[PDB]
Amino acid sequence: KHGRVFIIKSYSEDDIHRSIKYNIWCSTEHGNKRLDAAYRSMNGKGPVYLLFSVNGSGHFCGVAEMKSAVDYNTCAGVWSQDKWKGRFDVRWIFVKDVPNSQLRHIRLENNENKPVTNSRDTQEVPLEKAKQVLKIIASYK
Numbered sequence: 001k002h003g004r005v006f007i008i009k010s011y012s013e014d015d016i017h018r019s020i021k022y023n024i025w026c027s028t029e030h031g032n033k034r035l036d037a038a039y040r041s042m043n044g045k046g047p048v049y050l051l052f053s054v055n056g057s058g059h060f061c062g063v064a065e066m067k068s069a070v071d072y073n074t075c076a077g078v079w080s081q082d083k084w085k086g087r088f089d090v091r092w093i094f095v096k097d098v099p100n101s102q103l104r105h106i107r108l109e110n111n112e113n114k115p116v117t118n119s120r121d122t123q124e125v126p127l128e129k130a131k132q133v134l135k136i137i138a139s140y141k
């Protein structure tokens with residue numbers, strides 16, 4: 001495809017549940033700006049996919065598509081913590097726990113060849129490594 005794919009790291013499993021319930025997410029300022037630029041410059045040509053993992057959990061927990069630009073002025077305090085400013089919409093595609101052992105072989109040439117499972121929040125994944133990750137997530141039993 002023409003997709004672009006980002007890792008999402010959360011310190012809050014509660015915020016993930018809320019995001020699956022209401023189809024919204026929010027990253028840092030720096031993270032919002034990264035995802036905003038990628039979504040807008042995409043013009044609707046392809047999908048922005050988001051690969052979610054909770055920090056320390058040892059597993060990825062699903063896949064969602066970014067479904068709107070970033071709105072930086074929205075209701076405060078909707079998450080577990082107050083630090084988040086803004087909102088954007090998502091559509092969750094897969095909601096399943098996939099152990100990091102299933103993905104650790106995939107390394108990112110744009111991240112000093114580190115395993116994809118050792119990425120920080122909003123790390124971008126090269127397209128062919130991303131299609132690798134998505135195949136494993138979709139097919140995992």
Ligand SMILES: [Cl-]
Nearest residue numbers: 125126127128
């Ligand atoms: Cl690429």
